[PDB]
Each structure stands twice: as C-alpha cells, then as structure tokens.
C-alpha cells in the first residue's frame, strides 16, 4: 500500500524505451543474437545480464537505469560488426554498397546525438524545488519556517516533503 | 606498422577528451539555467549527511 504509491516502482509503457535509447533499442536484441552465434564465456555473461535486466526493467521503471549499460555494450557490438564489413575498403558496386550502408548508420549516429541532447534539455533538466514559467513557493515557505519559528519546532506534513524540510 | 599505432593512440586520446566534454556539457543544463541547487528528495538527505560528515568527524558520522 506504500510501495504501491511511489511513482518509481511502476511498470513501463513502450514509448519510454524509445525515449531513453533512440536507436540502441533495436540494435540491442541484434547484438545479443550476434553474441549467441559466437558463444564465449564473456558473451554468456552479457547474455544473462541482458535477459535479467530486460525483465527487471519492464517490471519496475527505476530498474531501467541498470538496463542502460548492457544495452550500450550490446549495441556497440552489433554496430561494430557492421563496420567491420562496410568500413573495410580492401570495384565500383561494392564500394557503392559499402558507402550506402555505412552512411545510413552514420546518419543514425548523428540523429542519436541530436535526440539525446533534446531529451536531456527538455525532460531531465529541471529541479523540483523551483518551477519555471519563476515560481518559487517551496523555498519561500521553507525559509520562512527557518527564519520565524523556534529552533526546536516540530512540523507535521506528508512524508513526500520530509527530507526537503 | 608503427605509425599506425601512434596514430591510434593520439586518436584515442582526442576521442576521450571529446567524450568527457560531451558528457559534462550535457549534464550542466540545470545548473546553467536556474542555479547550482539541490534537486528532488533523496539528494537532500544525502546532502545533509555529507554536511554532517564534513563539519564533524568520521567517528561522529
């Protein structure tokens, strides 16, 4: 009844997986599949990590953080494999196809950079104690409590605002 | 070859410099916009505990 009320312990909808990883979200399963076709012990570690954190991240949103490292790793494998074939210039048609593939994925890289910067500037760059419009009503009442109340005074409130007080 | 190794080392150094720069510039948005202030709720307990540690000793903490 309490763990059920905190917003950080709730399941995740699908858009939030694309919002937090632009195109690494469909390179992550491919990189896991590609780690299975060359099974080494280190790769088995990555596969187990991938599966477990995939489940735990969709069941609780606060556990998505733990999923973000392995994704990158997995993605960085898949992409790397692609670049081992189409960034290796060592004949017109083959050169043209290599250029097409590598250029499309480089475009995806630049778009990843842009999307990440926008998501950071828009969603994850605001404090909860000051609201923009500035509306600063928390710090005004907290500083009033700090200035015009006895030092040994007990303030009752909901638990959400405990620490801040 | 040998020039290849030196080229790769210099390139890796420059790449890691750019990585550090990108990371820090991406994080500095809220500090640049409003002020250097403490965020959400658990960081406030963390900050009050760090203050208590740096004012008193380790034994008291």
């Amino acid at each position: 009844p309490i763990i059920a009320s905190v917003s950080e312990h709730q399941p995740v909808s699908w858009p939030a997986f694309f919002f937090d990883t632009h195109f690494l979200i469909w390179l992550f399963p491919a990189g896991v599949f590609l780690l299975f076709l060359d099974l080494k012990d280190e790769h088995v570690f990555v596969i187990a990590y991938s599966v477990l954190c995939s489940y735990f991240a969709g069941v609780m949103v606060r556990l998505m953080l733990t999923l973000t490292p392995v994704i990158c790793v997995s993605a960085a494998v898949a992409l790397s494999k692609i670049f081992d074939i189409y960034l290796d210039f060592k004949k017109p048609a083959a050169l043209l196809a290599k250029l097409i593939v590598s250029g499309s994925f480089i475009f995806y890289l630049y778009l990843f950079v842009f999307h990440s910067t926008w998501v950071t500037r828009t969603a994850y760059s605001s404090p909860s104690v000051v609201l923009p419009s500035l509306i600063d009503d928390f710090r005004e009442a907290y500083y009033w409590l700090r200035m015009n109340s006895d030092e040994d005074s007990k303030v009752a409130a909901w638990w959400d605002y405990g620490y801040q007080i | 070859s040998c020039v290849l190794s030196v080229f790769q080392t210099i390139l890796k150094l420059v790449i890691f410099v750019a990585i550090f720069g990108a990371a820090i510039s991406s994080r500095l948005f809220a500090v640049i916009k409003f002020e250097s202030i403490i965020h959400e709720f658990d960081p406030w307990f963390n900050y009050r505990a760090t203050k208590y540690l740096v004012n008193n000793s380790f034994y008291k903490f």
């Binding site: 009320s5 905190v6 917003s7 950080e8 709730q10 949103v61 606060r62 909860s128 909901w158 638990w159 959400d160 | 959400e40 709720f41 658990d42």
Partner: peptide
C-alpha cells in the same frame, strides 16, 4: 519518476 507519492 522520483521517491514520491503519485
């Protein structure tokens, strides 16, 4: 998503 009621 923080350690707060919803």
């Amino acid at each position: 998503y923080a350690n707060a009621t919803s």
